[PDB]
Amino acid sequence: WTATSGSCKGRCFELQEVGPPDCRCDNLCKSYSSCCHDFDELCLKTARGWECTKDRCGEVRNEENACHCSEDCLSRGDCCTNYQVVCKGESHWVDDDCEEIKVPECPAGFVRPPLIIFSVDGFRASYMKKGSKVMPNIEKLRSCGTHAPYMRPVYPTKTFPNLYTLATGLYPESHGIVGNSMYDPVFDASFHLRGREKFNHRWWGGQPLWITATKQGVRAGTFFWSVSIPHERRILTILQWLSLPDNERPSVYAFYSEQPDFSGHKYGPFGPEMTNPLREIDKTVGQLMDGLKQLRLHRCVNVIFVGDHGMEDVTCDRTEFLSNYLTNVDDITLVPGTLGRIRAKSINNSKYDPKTIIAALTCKKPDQHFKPYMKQHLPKRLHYANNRRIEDIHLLVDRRWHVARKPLDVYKKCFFQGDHGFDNKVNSMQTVFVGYGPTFKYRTKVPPFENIELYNVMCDLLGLKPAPNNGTHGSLNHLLRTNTFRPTMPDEVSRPNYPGIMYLQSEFDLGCTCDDKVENKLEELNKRLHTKGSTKERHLLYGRPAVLYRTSYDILYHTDFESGYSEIFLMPLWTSYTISKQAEVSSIPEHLTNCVRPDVRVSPGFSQNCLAYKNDKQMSYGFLFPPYLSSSPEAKYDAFLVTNMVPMYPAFKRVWAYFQRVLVKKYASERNGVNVISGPIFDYNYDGLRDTEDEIKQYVEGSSIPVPTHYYSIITSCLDFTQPADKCDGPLSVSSFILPHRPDNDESCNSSEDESKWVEELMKMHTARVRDIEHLTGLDFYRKTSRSYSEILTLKTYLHTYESEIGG
Numbered sequence: 013w014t015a016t017s018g019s020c021k022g023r024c025f026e027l028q029e030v031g032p033p034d035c036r037c038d039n040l041c042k043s044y045s046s047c048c049h050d051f052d053e054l055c056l057k058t059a060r061g062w063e064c065t066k067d068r069c070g071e072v073r074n075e076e077n078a079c080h081c082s083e084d085c086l087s088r089g090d091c092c093t094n095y096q097v098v099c100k101g102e103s104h105w106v107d108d109d110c111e112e113i114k115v116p117e118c119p120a121g122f123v124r125p126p127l128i129i130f131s132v133d134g135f136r137a138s139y140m141k142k143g144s145k146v147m148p149n150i151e152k153l154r155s156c157g158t159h160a161p162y163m164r165p166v167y168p169t170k171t172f173p174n175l176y177t178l179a180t181g182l183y184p185e186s187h188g189i190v191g192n193s194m195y196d197p198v199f200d201a202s203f204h205l206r207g208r209e210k211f212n213h214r215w216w217g218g219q220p221l222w223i224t225a226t227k228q229g230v231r232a233g234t235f236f237w238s239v240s241i242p243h244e245r246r247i248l249t250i251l252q253w254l255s256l257p258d259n260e261r262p263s264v265y266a267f268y269s270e271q272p273d274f275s276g277h278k279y280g281p282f283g284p285e286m287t288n289p290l291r292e293i294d295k296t297v298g299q300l301m302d303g304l305k306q307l308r309l310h311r312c313v314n315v316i317f318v319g320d321h322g323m324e325d326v327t328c329d330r331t332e333f334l335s336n337y338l339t340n341v342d343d344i345t346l347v348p349g350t351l352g353r354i355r356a357k358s359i360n361n362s363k364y365d366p367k368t369i370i371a372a373l374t375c376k377k378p379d380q381h382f383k384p385y386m387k388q389h390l391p392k393r394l395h396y397a398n399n400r401r402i403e404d405i406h407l408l409v410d411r412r413w414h415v416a417r418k419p420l421d422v423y424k425k426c427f428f429q430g431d432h433g434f435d436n437k438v439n440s441m442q443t444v445f446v447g448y449g450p451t452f453k454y455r456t457k458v459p460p461f462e463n464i465e466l467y468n469v470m471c472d473l474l475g476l477k478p479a480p481n482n483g484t485h486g487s488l489n490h491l492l493r494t495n496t497f498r499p500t501m502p503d504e505v506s507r508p509n510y511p512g513i514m515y516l517q518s519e520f521d522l523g524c525t526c527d528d529k530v531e532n533k534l535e536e537l538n539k540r541l542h543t544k545g546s547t548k549e550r551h552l553l554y555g556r557p558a559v560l561y562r563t564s565y566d567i568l569y570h571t572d573f574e575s576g577y578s579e580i581f582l583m584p585l586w587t588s589y590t591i592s593k594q595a596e597v598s599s600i601p602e603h604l605t606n607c608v609r610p611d612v613r614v615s616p617g618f619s620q621n622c623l624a625y626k627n628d629k630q631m632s633y634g635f636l637f638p639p640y641l642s643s644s645p646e647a648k649y650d651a652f653l654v655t656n657m658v659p660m661y662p663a664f665k666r667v668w669a670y671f672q673r674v675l676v677k678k679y680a681s682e683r684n685g686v687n688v689i690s691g692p693i694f695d696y697n698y699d700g701l702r703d704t705e706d707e708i709k710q711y712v713e714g715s716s717i718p719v720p721t722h723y724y725s726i727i728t729s730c731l732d733f734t735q736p737a738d739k740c741d742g743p744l745s746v747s748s749f750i751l752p753h754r755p756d757n758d759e760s761c762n763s764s765e766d767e768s769k770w771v772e773e774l775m776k777m778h779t780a781r782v783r784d785i786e787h788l789t790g791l792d793f794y795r796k797t798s799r800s801y802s803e804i805l806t807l808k809t810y811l812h813t814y815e816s817e818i819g820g
């Protein structure tokens with residue numbers, strides 16, 4: 013109930029909100045149906061259009077007009093955006109040559125450059141090149157300012173998850189908006205697009221930019237706009253707000269366009285009907301810039317042109333139905349579309365079992381266009397598991413396809429040619445970024461980046477201190493003319509020990525055997541140097557990783573590799589080695605197949621044993637540095653130390669073996685040497701962060717040897733591949749993965765075939781940022797390079813996507 017008896021006269025688009033049952037006049041009261049009776053009349057005027065014609069010049073101020081062409085409108089801050097052009101012989105912003113904005117050129121009373129966020133829904137990255145003919149304002153913006161070829165959205169590539177990620181720097185799993193539709197069991201409540209629960213505050217976590225701004229005494233415009241408010245009225249309001257006195261004037265503003273997403277759903281991404289909405293976005297941009305120019309603010313304001321996600325070609329005839337797979341289709345709830353999430357329909361049903369559900373959905377058709385997953389087994393680069401609103405079962409859907417429950421849901425609930433929500437590395441889902449203004453760089457292209465990083469930047473452009481988020485502060489300083497934030501290396505928490513030979517072979521009772529009792533100042537003093545760390549300059553190219561938590565561990569040196577061995581987890585945390593282009597792959601000699609040697613540098617108490625693996629019929633073992641890449645028959649024995657050993661399921665050994673035997677060598681041939689860093693990851697609560705010892709849910713049977721949920725590798729080389737990895741002078745190039753350590757290969761439908769047909773594709777699916785591995789391990793890589801720490805932060809946020817070029 014609202015007593016809408018009050019007025020909006022003098023209060024059109026007020027910046028603060030008033031609590032019920034007074035009537036509101038803000039740009040959102042329509043969605044609440046609590047506007048004052050006179051809102052439309054006074055605030056939403058439309059008379060005479062949005063443009064000054066040649067006969068409106070110097071008119072008598074008629075208050076009924078949407079905008080004004082009178083003499084006093086510059087003073088009132090309510091002219092039409094084309095006023096100066098038509099009535100004063102000025103030119104449009106777009107028709108001017110772009111001159112570099114070396115310093116902010118602001119009017120007195122402006123204490124900082126304002127920030128304007130122009131967000132465009134569904135605006136696919138390829139539109140920047142492909143529609144460039146019909147978007148002249150956006151093209152001037154793009155090419156005079158700072159831009160990226162694309163910006164990666166978060167998963168799911170839906171509207172609300174991405175808009176709220178843009179505002180918070182958080183993953184949807186952390187901000188809580190994990191889709192366009194959600195169920196929260198703790199609340200016992202649901203979240204819809206069509207409804208009024210979505211307005212309730214409990215859904216929305218994190219600290220969005222406008223709240224961060226408010227709490228630090230920077231004033232914000234109100235970011236959201238009722239759908240019925242036309243885009244022209246949205247621009248003029250922003251401009252009016254900018255005309256306000258210094259003490260009332262916000263420092264940050266937002267504009268939202270429902271286009272091109274709206275038309276994109278109807279006509280597909282490249283529908284001939286798409287040119288017009290794109291024409292109309294550009295005109296709105298024109299309107300804004302012409303408006304800023306009138307205010308003399310076009311060389312003072314920072315403008316961000318950002319999309320939320322792309323748009324893919326999708327039709328009704330590309331739907332997969334769960335009813336063609338399952339028996340009890342009426343005992344499941346499905347959230348459908350471009351992703352799927354499944355739960356029990358009634359919780360008082362105890363004959364519901366997700367494992368049977370998943371099995372019924374696994375490679376059951378040769379053509380299958382979706383893949384079932386328990387959420388914790390989703391790839392880690394999606395960060396889509398640590399929220400109670402995320403269903404245990406998740407279907408990842410092929411681009412261009414839908415999943416539904418029964419055919420009756422698709423025709424009675426085609427009409428659409430476009431959709432989004434797919435895996436965020438999919439090309440059709442990438443969006444745009446362009447930054448324009450005094451604080452952004454001039455004519456600069458920057459590499460692609462993820463939208464999680466923007467919150468920090470917008471905080472910088474405003475002199476704000478960002479709330480704790482998932483961005484990597486300083487990773488986007490290279491977009492900026494001037495920073496404000498200078499990132500600093502975290503301090504190492506745990507210092508390593510450097511253990512020597514302390515123990516005799518016979519002290520070890522590990523139940524391991526190795527036929528190694530066969531073997532001179534020449535090649536015996538030499539191996540002393542190796543165990544002390546003579547060859548470390550070759551295998552540890554960027555400094556040891558720093559341990560950022562409290563723990564006890566040892567650095568172990570070897571001819572071929574170096575490890576950070578954890579006395580707590582009974583295995584290395586990391587193992588580092590260099591494979592040059594000239595390196596050769598050997599095999600494991602026949603006699604040394606089952607060989608495991610005691611490490612006389614580490615006590616039997618802090619060692620694994622072979623007996624545990626013998627007794628654990630499910631579990632087996634592998635090695636972090638691969639025997640296959642030993643540089644000599646003598647060095648090969650180093651590879652068989654109990655301290656290079658890690659638990660592995662037989663099914664996973666097939667993946668690992670091929671990575672170590674085939675792919676490392678291949679990468680080294682292609683990239684001119686690689687440095688490899690590998691290790692275990694423990695994330696049993698699927699929060700993307702390292703488990704502590706007391707959070708391990710699985711041990712190798714009858715032992716205190718913890719089983720990793722994942723294994724990672726960081727593979728580094730020179731960006732200039734003419735230079736060998738171990739003599740790289742300039743920038744580095746990197747690719748990484750976090751492979752799930754699973755006891756079956758149910759994820760790979762071609763796994764009964766040869767490793768050469770499926771393994772590499774699995775790896776590509778679980779591509780990772782070096783930053784993802786940091787959070788999951790509590791380590792910090794690249795401590796000692798010749799590169800700037802800003803450059804290294806950018807390297808760490810790099811994701812290698814394996815998608816071909818944008819456009820082709």
Ligand SMILES: *[C@@H]1O[C@H](CO)[C@@H](O[C@@H]2O[C@H](CO)[C@@H](O[C@@H]3O[C@H](CO[C@H]4O[C@H](CO[C@H]5O[C@H](CO)[C@@H](O)[C@H](O)[C@@H]5O)[C@@H](O)[C@H](O[C@H]5O[C@H](CO)[C@@H](O)[C@H](O)[C@@H]5O[C@H]5O[C@H](CO)[C@@H](O)[C@H](O)[C@@H]5O)[C@@H]4O)[C@@H](O)[C@H](O[C@H]4O[C@H](CO)[C@@H](O)[C@H](O)[C@@H]4O[C@H]4O[C@H](CO)[C@@H](O)[C@H](O)[C@@H]4O)[C@@H]3O)[C@H](O)[C@H]2NC(C)=O)[C@H](O)[C@H]1NC(C)=O
Pocket residue numbers: 182183185186187188214215216217218219395398399400479480481482699700701787
């Ligand atoms: C991506 O970035 C984000 C953000 O940086 C990372 O997420 C952060 O991770 C931290 C560590 O995991 C975590 O610390 C927690 O905090 C717990 C309480 O946190 C509440 O307060 C948060 C702050 O709000 C304030 O914000 C500003 C400052 O920024 C202030 O000025 C304001 O005044 C605000 O008050 C708040 O954000 C958080 O909100 C969550 O819950 C809300 C419901 O109330 C949701 O609306 C909201 O969406 C958040 O929900 C998410 O996160 C929670 C985890 O908190 C999770 O449950 C959900 O799935 C969802 O994803 C809270 O309201 C606090 O309880 C923790 O302390 C425990 O652990 C320590 C360990 O040392 C114990 O010593 C301690 O005693 C305590 O344990 C107790 O409970 C145990 C069981 O849990 C029990 O066994 C034990 O015996 C004890 O009783 C800890 O400090 C941050 O909260 C979290 N922040 C966010 C925003 O998520 C994230 O890690 C990054 N991701 C990656 C991959 O890197």
Ligand SMILES: O=C(/C=C/c1ccc(OC(F)(F)F)cc1)N1C[C@@H]2[C@H](C1)[C@H]1CN(C(=O)c3ccc4[nH]nnc4c3)C[C@@H]21
Pocket residue numbers: 129131133171172175176178179180192205221235236237238239266267268273274
């Ligand atoms: O005025 C705003 C947002 C302003 C904003 C400005 C900058 C921002 O970022 C920053 F924080 F960085 F500034 C963030 C937000 N709105 C009203 C609209 C919009 C959010 C949704 C789309 N929608 C669907 O109903 C909808 C739209 C497209 C869809 N595709 N598929 N389903 C769909 C559903 C209704 C909702």
Ligand SMILES: [Ca+2]
Pocket residue numbers: 694695696697698699700701702703
């Ligand atoms: Ca964890």
Ligand SMILES: [Cl-]
Pocket residue numbers: 168170190191192193347
């Ligand atoms: Cl959704």
Ligand SMILES: [Cl-]
Pocket residue numbers: 663666756757763
């Ligand atoms: Cl297998």
Ligand SMILES: [Cl-]
Pocket residue numbers: 563580703704705
């Ligand atoms: Cl620990």
Ligand SMILES: [Cl-]
Pocket residue numbers: 138439440818819820
């Ligand atoms: Cl594309």
